[PDB]
């Protein structure tokens, strides 16, 4: 779906998260929010289409005489005949469910971008890339207010109407 | 003025995946569910039973 | 292997600044977290916290006050500083590896060996 | 933050007999604990994560059960070698704590 560009192979610590850089330097910080969800959601789909194989056992083959080839042939016909069942609905499983991993996954960039870009309306300016630039100036204090989701608009609404001003 | 990112991760792994759309897509974190190798050995399950 | 070793100068006096400096042996320190956790004698473990290079460190909140986590990528170490040391901590020292992302979240596998650091006169 | 209650503090067990430790939460958890294995003045070893994750080289006798705020340790065969305090640690929110931690004494 929404997909991106880049690739952040210093964050080591989640799925996903943010890069700041302020007057105290950048870094690399995973949200743990977002990543403890889709590490729940994926865990249960892994355990439900596990579970749902999970049946019973049964002594696979069976052995027919000479005056029996024809039940014989029935036998080997519904052993093959399970044996595909299981193998393709295993295949298009794996299949399908990657795709939706992919897609799950995607969701969920977007969802925590959505959410940065409603605390940030109108103090910060969207670079793009996937970043967002700041009209004002955000302190460590105020990047951990937004990374849990509790950004003080007003806070800083005068700073960044007069510096966003002063550019046009 | 400060700058303040969104991304994900990335690393060395070259797990290789299939999808119905597309094949050999390389992903961060696997699992294969196949078992593909035996020791060759008739050996006992708890006992020396096997006759 | 990734091996942790531990420096600690085993006295502290009650009024001053504890600096423990834990070595690694063969991990490149800029790419991973690293943590410091910490024992009373046989009593429980405490997390004391975590830094790391291009990241943003987060400490215990008890000793958030005091605690200052710096990283040598020279000589491939991390050191905690403590300020104000009381004679309360007064315990073992332990310095960790925080692993990166699995399936099961953020592991440390690795450990230190473990430092004795008594606060007295 | 959270807080942790191992129970039962001391325990002392013939060989072979299983064994269970409860780790109960202040706060629930998405089975993100982690149980470790403290010996004698030696540094502390993980032994599963997840709550169900044995990690590797651990000897299958150890199982991990649990969700939400209640989860157990039990091994499953008790032998010489696992006489130590055992530690749950949880990473759901920091700051990260851990249990008291329970002495697993051997019965001989």
């Known amino acids: 779906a929404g997909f991106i560009e880049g690739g952040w192979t210093g964050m080591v610590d989640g799925w996903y998260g943010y890069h700041h850089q302020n007057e105290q330097g950048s870094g690399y910080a995973a949200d743990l929010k977002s990543t403890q969800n889709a590490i729940d959601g994926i865990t249960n789909k892994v355990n439900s289409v596990i579970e749902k194989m999970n049946t019973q056992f049964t002594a696979v083959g069976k052995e027919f005489n000479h005056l029996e080839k024809r039940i014989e042939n029935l036998n080997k016909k519904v052993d093959d005949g399970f044996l595909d069942i299981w193998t393709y609905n295993a295949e298009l499983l794996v299949l399908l469910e990657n795709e939706r991993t992919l897609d799950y996954h995607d969701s969920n960039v977007k969802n925590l971008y959505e959410k940065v870009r409603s605390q940030l309306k109108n103090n910060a300016k969207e670079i793009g890339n996937g970043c967002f630039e700041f009209y004002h100036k955000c302190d460590n204090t105020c990047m951990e207010s937004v990374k849990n989701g509790t950004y003080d608009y007003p806070k800083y609404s005068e700073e960044a109407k007069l510096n966003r001003e002063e550019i046009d | 003025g400060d700058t303040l990112c969104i991304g994900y991760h990335a690393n060395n792994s070259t797990d290789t995946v299939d999808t119905l759309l597309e094949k050999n897509v390389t992903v961060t974190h696997s699992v294969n569910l196949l078992e593909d190798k035996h020791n060759g050995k008739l050996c006992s399950i708890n006992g020396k039973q096997p006759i | 292997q990734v091996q942790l070793q531990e420096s600690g100068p085993g006295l502290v006096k009650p009024s001053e600044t504890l600096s423990l400096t834990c070595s690694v042996s063969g991990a490149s320190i800029s790419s991973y977290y690293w943590i410091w956790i910490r024992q009373p004698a046989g009593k429980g473990l405490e997390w004391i916290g975590r830094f790391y290079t291009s990241g943003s460190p987060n400490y215990n909140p008890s000793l958030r006050s005091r605690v200052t986590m710096s990283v040598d990528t020279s000589k491939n170490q991390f050191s905690l500083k403590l300020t104000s040391v009381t004679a309360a901590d007064t315990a073992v020292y332990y310095c960790?590896?925080?692993?990166?992302?699995?399936?099961?979240?953020?592991?440390?596998?690795?450990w230190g060996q473990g430092t004795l650091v008594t606060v007295s006169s | 933050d959270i807080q942790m209650t191992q129970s039962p503090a001391t325990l002392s067990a013939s060989v072979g007999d299983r064994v269970s430790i409860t780790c109960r939460a202040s706060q629930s958890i998405s089975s993100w604990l982690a149980w470790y294995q403290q010996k004698p003045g030696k540094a502390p070893k993980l032994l599963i994560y997840?709550?169900?994750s044995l990690e590797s080289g651990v000897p299958s006798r150890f199982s991990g059960s649990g969700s939400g705020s209640e989860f157990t340790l039990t091994i499953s065969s008790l032998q010489p070698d696992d006489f130590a305090i055992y530690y749950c640690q949880q990473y759901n929110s920091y700051p990260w704590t851990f249990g008291q931690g329970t002495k697993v004494e051997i019965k001989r």
């Open positions: 997840k709550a169900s």
């Open positions: 960790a590896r925080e692993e990166h992302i699995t399936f099961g979240g953020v592991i440390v596998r690795y």
